[PDB]
Design an enzyme around this catalytic site. Structure first.
Site, PDB file in Angstrom:
ATOM      1  N   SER A 116      -9.526  17.211 -52.640  1.00  0.00           N
ATOM      2  CA  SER A 116      -7.875  16.524 -53.150  1.00  0.00           C
ATOM      3  C   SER A 116      -6.719  17.517 -53.334  1.00  0.00           C
ATOM      4  O   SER A 116      -7.282  18.276 -54.155  1.00  0.00           O
ATOM      5  CB  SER A 116      -8.046  15.878 -54.002  1.00  0.00           C
ATOM      6  OG  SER A 116      -7.243  14.674 -54.298  1.00  0.00           O
ATOM      7  N   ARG A 117      -5.526  17.296 -53.172  1.00  0.00           N
ATOM      8  CA  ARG A 117      -4.278  18.031 -52.538  1.00  0.00           C
ATOM      9  C   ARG A 117      -3.540  18.241 -54.468  1.00  0.00           C
ATOM     10  O   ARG A 117      -2.622  18.584 -54.386  1.00  0.00           O
ATOM     11  CB  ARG A 117      -3.673  18.842 -51.559  1.00  0.00           C
ATOM     12  CG  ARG A 117      -4.203  19.918 -50.934  1.00  0.00           C
ATOM     13  CD  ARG A 117      -5.825  19.266 -50.043  1.00  0.00           C
ATOM     14  NE  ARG A 117      -4.850  18.250 -49.084  1.00  0.00           N
ATOM     15  CZ  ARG A 117      -3.857  18.612 -47.936  1.00  0.00           C
ATOM     16  NH1 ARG A 117      -3.880  20.228 -47.716  1.00  0.00           N
ATOM     17  NH2 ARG A 117      -3.278  18.244 -47.443  1.00  0.00           N
ATOM     18  N   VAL A 118      -3.520  17.100 -54.402  1.00  0.00           N
ATOM     19  CA  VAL A 118      -3.116  16.273 -56.492  1.00  0.00           C
ATOM     20  C   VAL A 118      -3.939  17.814 -57.157  1.00  0.00           C
ATOM     21  O   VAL A 118      -3.195  17.792 -58.392  1.00  0.00           O
ATOM     22  CB  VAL A 118      -2.696  15.580 -56.775  1.00  0.00           C
ATOM     23  CG1 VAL A 118      -2.370  14.771 -55.704  1.00  0.00           C
ATOM     24  CG2 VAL A 118      -4.354  14.645 -57.377  1.00  0.00           C
TER      25      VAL A 118
END
Ligand SMILES: Nc1ncnc2c1ncn2[C@@H]1O[C@H](COP(=O)(O)OP(=O)(O)O)[C@@H](O)[C@H]1O
Ligand SMILES: [Mg+2]
Lengths: 254, 351, 54, 55, 147, 52
Positions: A116-118
């Site tokens: 997850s790139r948040v």
């Protein structure tokens, strides 16, 4: 609901049956085909649907829209046409395998390939503190998972790394239609990542958890209102949670 | 309709790990020559004579010989009667000698007779269809002359629409109920082909057959780690059946990862703790194989029919360790667990 | 002495069985990648030739 | 074991005793006493000998 | 409704100490956790009975309202409290028996406390006595000390 | 000293657990009275749901 200051959620079940219902409409209208007989604009079909999910700011209302698309692969090949379009559009994937589903891990989320790139900027302060070490602890276990089948002549650190990885896994299993709360979730992780379980037998980690959760709902309700409302876990609540899992673990087996 | 039940058959692999249901669509997968026609001949033997209402058999695109071994195995069992008005089975046949415009309208003719009994009458109907891959293939032959560009590996562009237009009439409504068993040919052992891999959305219970089991001698070759159901649910089958089903799949899947070690190390160099989970798994593989009734002329053995309460109690005792004193051969092609020890002593005396 | 002679040769003979199995694992990765491209190329021609003759 | 398994063809009648389950656990001095005791009380009274091993 | 509080079930109430009967004390705490969640499942007040909408929606009258007239003026008698007193009766007899250690061993404390007073008296001077040292260290009859 | 506190240990133990037995049975009558008021609304809700 996004235009009027509210919040929303949407689930597409599933997007791999929209690219097929659109391919039939193309080839009957005599359009030039492409790879796997899909038209030239199947990327433009899925991009302008997922880009409508946005986090608005306060000058427009503060609304939001969250999008969860489902995609079915074939034989676990994500390098097909449509499993590579929707991967490069979205942010992160949750990769459910079939091998872990029959080995007992249910829900069968592979955390080796899920990202997850948040990042950690969407976790609360309570969950962020304990799970930052759990993510590092589980990642050290997956390096040494191939020594478990024949391992007794190893170092005591490596025997410890296997001992925490099995018991952290049993905390992650969960029955169907039983969603928990974040204040109850952080307490169970806090019981495991500190070291309060390395003497309990690995088969009892499920029975210990269902016993411990029904205790702290009725007998420690005033602690799970000072992690829900506070958001963080302070130094006062760090000591108050510390004697709780030591009181329950002392007289447990009965 | 929304209600779910369980329809008991008497087969040990089916009732344990993937139970069938009344008024639910059932699928029989697998390649060519593994037993799809025999397993669909078994459920006419058990289920259709104990059933109250009528029954319909539509045969779509299969050998014209095998429509004569059904007309002559249903007169001598009295299901078809040639002398009065007490028969219980209709038959609709379009076989593989027909032009390809006629192998794609026979399955629509099968479920038109079976729609009369459900709607204009109220009885409980069954429906057996073999084969149903020959509905998709027979429409992929008239396609290119009608003026259509082909899709992926060679099927028509309207593949998943006319399939979903037939498979939405085989349902349980508020006027009746249609149990339906279907055999589905998988082309050259590849379940990612676009014809079998779109029928999965229309089936409740899938029974995936396999050639890697059938070449061991385990019959019926049903894959336990690839068959599902919608009612494998501890609120429907009870909590005792549920923790037995998952206890079997967990020891079979853990047996799979152990075969990768024996190929380099060997069997004897293993520890004594996982020399036992292999020997418990090999007895669970062999206990699932049951001698069928309509396969007597292949085998010579007799036809067994294990009830549901005995299938669970047979598998609790191999897992708990109450039969660690027997060799593996005492469970091959037996009925209930009582015959597993009677067959154990009879092998001993011939030494 | 014999349980040290044996336990050191198990260290070497399990080391060359992972070099030869990793030398073999790159040569099959190139052949997998030539064959993966050649199937997308081949079944693309069949769709184009099917539409052109129509 | 693997000494007896190799020599099972050519010299199956020149064996005295064979000792298996050796090498799984580390060897100790008690197992050097179990073997040397049974080399005496067998009935074979010998007068020379030699041992072969991998130093 | 009515709801009374209790005391702390922390240290004493799970350490009743029977004849190795820690299982019976463990079952005693297990009933308090079960009933407190069953009291947390249902509230003190139930839902309200709307009477006016019953007459119009169920407007086939007579049979609908006669059940609603008989079930409205009913009463729910709760179960008896006959076993409530006898379980509380045995607590009154055991509490009178539990002070027997506070009754009998109190003199055993003071007799041991008075024994510490006379034990100071005996040691005295280094060269004190051959009979005052003959209380702690023993003597006996003929042929006792073997060695 | 250790047998003086052995007197007082059993007189704080006994009065705690002899009131736990008061309140472990006290909850047994509330949850069977609360479910008595609730159930008599449930079987008159069935008739409020049937005739419609
Ligand atoms: N009860 C059984 N168990 C295992 N194999 C069977 C059984 N009955 C038939 N077979 C095997 O299945 C093969 C194909 O049988 P059939 O079901 O008629 O063909 P298909 O499944 O291809 O339509 C036969 O060669 C036979 O050996
Ligand atoms: Mg067939």
């Amino acid at each position: 609901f996004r235009d009027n200051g509210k919040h929303a959620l949407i689930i597409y079940d599933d997007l791999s049956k929209q690219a097929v219902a659109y391919r039939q409409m193309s080839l009957l209208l005599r359009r030039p085909p492409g790879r796997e007989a899909y038209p030239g604009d199947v990327f433009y079909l899925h991009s302008r649907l997922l880009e409508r999910a946005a986090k608005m700011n306060d000058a427009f209302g503060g609304g939001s829209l969250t999008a969860l698309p489902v995609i079915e692969t074939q034989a676990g090949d994500v390098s097909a046409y449509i499993p590579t379009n929707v991967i490069s559009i979205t942010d992160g994937q949750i990769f459910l395998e079939t091998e872990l589903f029959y080995k007992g891990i249910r829900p069968a989320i592979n955390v080796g390939l899920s990202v997850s790139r948040v990042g950690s900027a969407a976790q609360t302060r309570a969950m962020k503190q304990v799970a930052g070490t759990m993510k590092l602890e589980l990642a050290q276990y997956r390096e040494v998972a191939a020594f478990a089948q024949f391992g007794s002549d190893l170092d005591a650190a490596t025997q410890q790394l296997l001992s925490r990885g099995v018991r952290l896994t049993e905390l992650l299993k969960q029955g169907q239609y039983a969603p928990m709360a974040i204040e109850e979730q952080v307490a169970v992780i806090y019981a495991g990542v500190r070291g309060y379980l390395d003497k309990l037998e690995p088969s009892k980690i499920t029975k210990f958890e269902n016993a411990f959760l029904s205790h702290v709902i009725s007998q420690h309700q005033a602690l799970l209102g000072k992690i829900r409302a506070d958001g963080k876990i302070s130094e006062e609540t760090d000591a108050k949670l510390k004697e709780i899992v030591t009181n329950f673990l002392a007289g447990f087996e009965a | 309709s929304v209600e779910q039940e369980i329809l008991v058959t008497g087969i040990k692999v089916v009732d344990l790990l993937a139970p069938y249901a009344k008024g639910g669509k059932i699928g029989l997968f697998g390649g060519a020559g593994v037993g799809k026609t025999v397993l669909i001949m078994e459920l006419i033997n058990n289920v259709a004579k104990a059933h109250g209402g009528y029954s319909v058999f539509a045969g779509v695109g299969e050998r014209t010989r095998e429509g004569n071994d059904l007309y002559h195995e249903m007169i001598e069992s009295g299901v078809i009667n040639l002398k009065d008005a007490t028969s219980k089975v209709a038959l609709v046949y379009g076989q593989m000698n027909e032009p390809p415009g006629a192998r794609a309208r026979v399955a629509l003719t099968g479920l038109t007779v079976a729609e009369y009994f459900r709607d204009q009458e109220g009885q409980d109907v069954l429906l057996f269809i073999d084969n149903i891959f020959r509905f998709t293939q027979a429409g992929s032959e008239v396609s290119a002359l009608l003026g259509r560009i082909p899709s992926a590996v060679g099927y028509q562009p309207t593949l998943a629409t006319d399939m979903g237009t037939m498979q939405e009439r085989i349902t349980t409504t508020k006027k009746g109920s249609i149990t339906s068993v279907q055999a589905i040919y998988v082309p050259a052992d590849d379940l990612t082909d676009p014809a079998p891999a779109t029928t999965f959305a229309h089936l409740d219970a899938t029974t995936v057959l396999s050639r890697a089991i059938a070449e061991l001698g385990i019959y019926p070759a049903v894959d336990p780690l690839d068959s599902t159901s919608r009612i494998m649910d501890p609120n429907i089958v009870g909590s005792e059946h549920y923790d037995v089903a998952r206890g079997v799949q967990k020891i079979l899947q853990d047996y799979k990862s152990l075969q990768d070690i024996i190929a380099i190390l060997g069997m004897d160099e293993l520890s004594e703790e996982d020399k036992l989970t292999v020997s418990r798994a090999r007895k669970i593989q062999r206990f699932l194989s049951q001698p069928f009734q309509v396969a007597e002329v292949f085998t010579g053995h007799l036809g067994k029919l294990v009830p549901l309460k005995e299938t669970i109690k047979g598998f609790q005792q191999i897992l708990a360790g109450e039969y660690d004193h027997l060799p593996e051969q005492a469970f091959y092609m037996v009925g209930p667990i009582e015959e597993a020890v009677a067959k154990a002593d009879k092998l001993a005396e011939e030494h | 002495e014999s349980t040290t002679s044996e336990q050191s040769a198990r260290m070497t003979a399990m080391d060359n069985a992972s070099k030869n199995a990793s030398e073999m694992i790159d040569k099959l990765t190139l052949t997998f990648n030539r064959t993966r491209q050649a199937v997308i190329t081949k079944e693309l021609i069949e769709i184009i030739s099917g539409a052109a003759a129509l | 074991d693997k000494i007896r398994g190799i020599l099972h063809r050519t010299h199956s009648d020149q064996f005295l005793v064979t000792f298996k389950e050796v090498g799984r656990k580390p060897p100790t001095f008690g197992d050097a006493s179990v073997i040397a005791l049974e080399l005496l009380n067998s009935g074979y009274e010998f007068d020379e000998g030699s041992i072969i091993f991998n130093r | 409704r009515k709801l009374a509080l209790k005391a702390i079930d922390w240290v004493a109430f799970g350490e009743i100490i029977p004849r190795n009967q820690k299982a019976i004390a463990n079952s005693l705490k297990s009933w308090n956790e079960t009933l407190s969640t069953r009291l947390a499942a249902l509230p003190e007040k139930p839902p309200a009975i709307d009477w006016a909408y019953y007459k119009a929606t169920v407007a086939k009258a007579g049979l609908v309202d006669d059940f609603e007239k008989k079930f409205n003026a009913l009463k729910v008698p709760v179960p008896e409290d006959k076993y409530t007193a006898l379980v509380d009766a045995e607590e009154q007899e055991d509490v009178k028996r539990c002070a027997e250690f506070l009754s009998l061993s109190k003199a055993r404390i003071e007799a041991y406390e008075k024994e510490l007073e006379k034990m100071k008296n005996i040691i005295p001077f280094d060269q004190m006595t051959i009979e005052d040292l003959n209380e702690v260290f023993p003597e006996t009859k003929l042929d006792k000390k073997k060695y | 000293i250790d047998l003086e506190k052995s007197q007082q240990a059993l007189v704080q133990k006994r009065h705690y657990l002899f009131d736990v037995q008061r309140n472990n049975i006290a909850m047994a009558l509330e949850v069977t009275y609360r479910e008595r008021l609730h159930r008599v609304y449930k079987e008159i809700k069935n008739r409020l749901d049937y005739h419609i």
